[PDB]
Design a protein around this motif. Structure first.
Motif, PDB file in Angstrom:
ATOM      1  N   UNK A  53      22.656 108.723 -60.544  1.00  0.00           N
ATOM      2  CA  UNK A  53      21.538 109.200 -61.340  1.00  0.00           C
ATOM      3  C   UNK A  53      21.262 108.236 -62.491  1.00  0.00           C
ATOM      4  N   UNK A  54      22.323 107.725 -63.130  1.00  0.00           N
ATOM      5  CA  UNK A  54      22.196 106.718 -64.197  1.00  0.00           C
ATOM      6  C   UNK A  54      21.500 105.458 -63.698  1.00  0.00           C
ATOM      7  N   UNK A  55      21.847 105.039 -62.484  1.00  0.00           N
ATOM      8  CA  UNK A  55      21.348 103.794 -61.901  1.00  0.00           C
ATOM      9  C   UNK A  55      20.017 103.957 -61.181  1.00  0.00           C
ATOM     10  N   UNK A  56      19.537 105.196 -61.093  1.00  0.00           N
ATOM     11  CA  UNK A  56      18.270 105.495 -60.436  1.00  0.00           C
ATOM     12  C   UNK A  56      18.315 105.420 -58.922  1.00  0.00           C
ATOM     13  N   UNK A  57      19.506 105.575 -58.343  1.00  0.00           N
ATOM     14  CA  UNK A  57      19.648 105.688 -56.896  1.00  0.00           C
ATOM     15  C   UNK A  57      19.333 107.094 -56.409  1.00  0.00           C
ATOM     16  N   UNK A  58      18.861 107.182 -55.166  1.00  0.00           N
ATOM     17  CA  UNK A  58      18.701 108.460 -54.491  1.00  0.00           C
ATOM     18  C   UNK A  58      20.031 109.199 -54.548  1.00  0.00           C
ATOM     19  N   UNK A  59      19.990 110.452 -54.986  1.00  0.00           N
ATOM     20  CA  UNK A  59      21.202 111.259 -55.086  1.00  0.00           C
ATOM     21  C   UNK A  59      21.740 111.582 -53.702  1.00  0.00           C
ATOM     22  N   UNK A  60      23.075 111.504 -53.530  1.00  0.00           N
ATOM     23  CA  UNK A  60      23.688 111.809 -52.238  1.00  0.00           C
ATOM     24  C   UNK A  60      23.558 113.308 -51.958  1.00  0.00           C
ATOM     25  N   UNK A  61      23.796 113.740 -50.704  1.00  0.00           N
ATOM     26  CA  UNK A  61      23.632 115.152 -50.350  1.00  0.00           C
ATOM     27  C   UNK A  61      24.505 116.066 -51.197  1.00  0.00           C
ATOM     28  N   UNK A  62      24.140 117.342 -51.269  1.00  0.00           N
ATOM     29  CA  UNK A  62      24.950 118.334 -51.966  1.00  0.00           C
ATOM     30  C   UNK A  62      26.321 118.531 -51.341  1.00  0.00           C
ATOM     31  N   UNK A  63      27.312 118.769 -52.198  1.00  0.00           N
ATOM     32  CA  UNK A  63      28.694 119.013 -51.795  1.00  0.00           C
ATOM     33  C   UNK A  63      28.775 120.087 -50.715  1.00  0.00           C
ATOM     34  N   UNK A  64      29.514 119.789 -49.648  1.00  0.00           N
ATOM     35  CA  UNK A  64      29.656 120.687 -48.492  1.00  0.00           C
ATOM     36  C   UNK A  64      28.312 121.198 -47.958  1.00  0.00           C
ATOM     37  N   UNK A  65      27.480 120.283 -47.458  1.00  0.00           N
ATOM     38  CA  UNK A  65      26.183 120.654 -46.872  1.00  0.00           C
ATOM     39  C   UNK A  65      26.275 120.868 -45.353  1.00  0.00           C
ATOM     40  N   UNK A  66      27.438 120.557 -44.778  1.00  0.00           N
ATOM     41  CA  UNK A  66      27.769 120.987 -43.413  1.00  0.00           C
ATOM     42  C   UNK A  66      28.183 122.466 -43.411  1.00  0.00           C
ATOM     43  N   UNK A  67      28.751 122.910 -44.536  1.00  0.00           N
ATOM     44  CA  UNK A  67      28.986 124.332 -44.826  1.00  0.00           C
ATOM     45  C   UNK A  67      27.646 125.052 -45.080  1.00  0.00           C
ATOM     46  N   UNK A  68      26.840 124.492 -45.987  1.00  0.00           N
ATOM     47  CA  UNK A  68      25.530 125.035 -46.351  1.00  0.00           C
ATOM     48  C   UNK A  68      24.418 124.325 -45.585  1.00  0.00           C
TER      49      UNK A  68
END
Lengths: 221, 218
Positions: A206-221
């Motif tokens: 977020x500091x570097x302006x990169x696309x944020x990685x997926x949410x934690x445990x998104x295979x769960x959700x």
């Protein structure tokens, strides 16, 4: 007392890994952090055997016992001597196709698959097969030899951490001239210690302006 | 079909070696130049067997069959994380003695003698024996690990070619905290190709303002 073990691929030390480890360290002054350089294969075995808790790597894992997430695609660049005709294009960038007849330096000479097979795959995938190919021991050898006038090299963009006299880095215009960065964990991994590590990545990104990685445990959700 | 073979240790790639090779190359557009990464022990044996013609390295080997010349002494620096107390003295500089109780990352893990034995020798020469020692694979591992907060490292000054976020280089105040750079040739060596190589080094040194190495053949 409490120990977290992290496996990683060498080249990532030029990227955001150290910053991530150091920030992570601050979140947990209690925690003992062990770092191990290891390839994707060794990471897979270690994760399954509980010998590491998270692995950072550049290859995809073919194993149901492992949950792998793409963090970002790092751009590839061309390392060239300042006087190479390709360097006249430093501001514009060049295409993979422009490189097919150049003496190309691949690395490292460690067991395969590795970054040298990755580079050749990138070319292969664009219908290209460079013949003037020379495999060299490690990144600093590729760069040094380039700076010496021995040829060109393809490198991840963070390799720009190394600056040598008369060494220049030219962007590649090919959308898919990339090298991926993955986190790998045990499929059932739920620990807050790993969550925190993953959240640190999210914060840096977020500091570097990169696309944020997926949410934690998104295979769960 | 004329070939000149050159042996070198990897750490010199961050110094003046590439620039030298490139400039040498232009003086001899005819010449096939082969570069081989090898430690000073391998260089010594290769020279005697004619497998290389000149060797660049940092460690002495005692051998009557080899003529070795000091080109320059490079400063050693301490690599530290920006937050390390030692970085408070970035402008001032520190002493080897300030380091003994630090976790020190040595490299590389190639055959000895290498740069880590040199570093340990430097401590030894100053009556120092650090115990929190960890041998690590390559320079990039050491610096990366430092930048991650895993410890400190000693590097040659030219290794500052590597810059990483929050990695800081601190000068050493001990006059002899240095790492030398040598050229080694066969004792009877007098080829113009090696002469030319040596003069190329002289030329760069004059551009850079370094003190000129000895005259060719003393």
């Amino acid at each position: 007392e409490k120990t977290i073990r992290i496996g990683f691929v060498g080249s990532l030390l030029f990227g955001l890994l150290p910053r991530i480890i150091h920030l992570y360290r601050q979140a947990h002054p209690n925690l003992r952090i062990e770092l191990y350089e290891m390839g994707t294969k060794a990471q897979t075995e270690a994760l399954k055997e509980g010998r590491i808790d998270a692995g950072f790597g550049r290859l995809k894992i073919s194993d149901p016992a492992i949950k792998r997430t793409l963090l970002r695609n790092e751009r590839l660049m061309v390392a060239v001597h300042a006087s190479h005709p390709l360097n006249q294009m430093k501001d514009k960038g060049v295409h993979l196709n422009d490189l097919i007849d150049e003496k190309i330096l691949l690395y490292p000479s460690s067991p395969k698959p590795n970054f040298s097979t990755h580079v050749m795959n990138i070319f292969s995938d664009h219908g290209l097969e460079p013949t003037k190919i020379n495999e060299v021991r490690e990144v600093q050898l590729a760069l040094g030899l380039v700076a010496a006038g021995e040829g060109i090299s393809l490198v991840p963009a963070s390799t720009q951490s190394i600056q040598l006299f008369n060494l220049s880095y030219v962007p590649l215009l090919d959308p898919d001239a990339i090298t991926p960065i993955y986190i790998a964990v045990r499929n059932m991994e739920e620990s807050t210690y790993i969550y925190s590590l993953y959240e640190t990545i999210r914060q840096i990104y977020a500091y570097e302006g990169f696309t944020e990685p997926p949410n934690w445990l998104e295979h769960h959700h």
